[PDB]
Amino acid sequence: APRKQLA
Amino acid sequence: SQKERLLDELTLEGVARYMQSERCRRVICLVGAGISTSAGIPDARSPSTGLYDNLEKYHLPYPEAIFEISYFKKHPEPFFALAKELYPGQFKPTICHYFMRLLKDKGLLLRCYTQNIDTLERIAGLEQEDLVEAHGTFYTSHCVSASCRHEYPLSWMKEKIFSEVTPKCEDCQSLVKPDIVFFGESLPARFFSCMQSDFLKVDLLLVMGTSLQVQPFASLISKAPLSTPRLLINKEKAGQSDPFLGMIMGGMDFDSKKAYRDVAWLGECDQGCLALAELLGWKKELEDLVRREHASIDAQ
Ligand SMILES: NC(=O)c1ccc[n+]([C@@H]2O[C@H](COP(=O)([O-])OP(=O)(O)OC[C@H]3O[C@@H](n4cnc5c(N)ncnc54)[C@H](O)[C@@H]3O)[C@@H](O)[C@H]2O)c1
Ligand SMILES: *C(=O)CCCCCCCCCCCCC
Ligand SMILES: [Zn+2]
């Protein structure tokens, strides 16, 4: 599950 | 997967020649909060002007929290109050939004992927066909109850936010949340199905007003074929591989000796778009559209 996140 | 060089020169002028070659049929735009700062919606990470710099008021652990889902679940009132502070009286898309309009009108736009939630791309006249709203939109809102999920339009959401009433569904009295993707949430399915297809045949990637640090949106630049030229119009360079993260198991390459297809035009997105339009012979067309559309909005 690719979730919205900073990186 | 070969790294052949399709621009005659790594400059705006190079990009403009390429765009009017036979090789350039399908353009993808990737845009972020920078294209909407001139419409009066602040970006997040700018110093002084960015949102994170201006969230002392809300009793927040890290200003990032106001857009995180777990926080929004505990206390949604802060997000609604901020939404009230930012919501523009008038929604006027920018020169850069209209630039993409011109792309669509000239049959060049295969898609606009946007990180923005502000609907400005729709107001400038990109349809749902042309557009992938990767972080969702204020355009519609839904009751969060799995069994209800009643949809509400923005005039209803707006009235609730300007009322300072925490918006509640008329069918079930649950919370009604704008259809945006918070931090921690999954992107919409349309995002994934579009990317699996459109980056197979893109001829030019136009990246405007994004730091390219929100994932998985940012990974989109690597989806293009390796010979697809990529132009960044941004106040600062972005998307280049970090030297440390890089060293562990492709980013933008503007400046190394290896550079072959990435170009950075640094400034106001509104200016870069005007500059590119002028090279394409589109300047009058863009000036007239923008003025006609603003006048129209100004007389509503
Ligand atoms: N308008 C909105 O919908 C809005 C507003 C704030 C934040 N957000 C979202 O929060 C996250 C922040 O990401 P982001 O990268 O889009 O914004 P960001 O704050 O992460 O960075 C935007 C980038 O645009 C640049 N920029 C800002 N104003 C510019 C201008 N006038 N001309 C040229 N470049 C300019 C900044 O230097 C930065 O590089 C995303 O999910 C973003 O879309 C959305
Ligand atoms: C991922 O991008 C999360 C951040 C998106 C929420 C911030 C949007 C800025 C607030 C503007 C609301 C008013 C516009 C209709
Ligand atoms: Zn409901």
Burial of B67 (0-12, 13-18, 19+ CB in 10 A): buried
How far is the C-alpha of B234 from the C-alpha of B213, rounded, in Å? 14
Chain A contact for B241 (CB, 8 A cutoff): no
B51-89+138-180 has the same fold as B12-40+94-135+188-298: no
Helix, strand, or coil (residue B258): coil
Neighbour count for residue B299 (Cβ, 10 Å): 6
DSSP state of B64: G
The angle at the Cα of B209, spanning B226 to B184, to the nearest 5 degrees, equals 85
The domain at B51-89+138-180 falls in which architecture? 2-Layer Sandwich (3.30)
B178: Cβ below 6 Å to ligand 1? no
Q: Are B44 and B62 in contact (CB under 8 A)?
A: no
A5/B187 touch (CB, cutoff 8 Å), yes or no: no
Chain A contact for B186 (CB, 8 A cutoff): yes
The yes or no reply on domain B12-40+94-135+188-298 and CATH 1.10.1060.10 is no
Q: Which residue from B210, B38, B50 is spatially nearest to B115, judged by alpha carbons?
A: B210
The pairing of strands B136-143 and B151-153 is antiparallel
B115: Cβ below 6 Å to ligand 2? yes
How far is the C-alpha of B142 from the C-alpha of B224, rounded, in Å? 34
Residues of chain A contacting residue B183, judged by C-beta atoms under 8 Å apart: 4-6
Q: Are B5 and B261 in contact (CB under 8 A)?
A: yes
Give all strands of the β-sheet with B176-180 in edge-to-edge order.
B151-153, B136-143, B176-180
Chain A contact for B216 (CB, 8 A cutoff): yes
Q: How was this structure determined?
A: X-ray
Within 8 A by CB and 6+ apart from B181, the residues are A4, B134, B135, B136, B187, B188
SS (H, E, C) B2-30: CCCCCCCCCCHHHHHHHHCCCCCCCEEEE
Q: Atom 17 (ligand 1): residue with closest C-alpha?
A: B33
SS (H, E, C) B172-212: CCCEEEEEECCECCECCHHHHHHHHHHCCCCCEEEEECCCC
Pull the structure tokens for residue B34. Answer: 């920078």
The pairing of strands A5-6 and B214-215 is antiparallel
Ranges of each domain in chain B: 12-40+94-135+188-298, 51-89+138-180
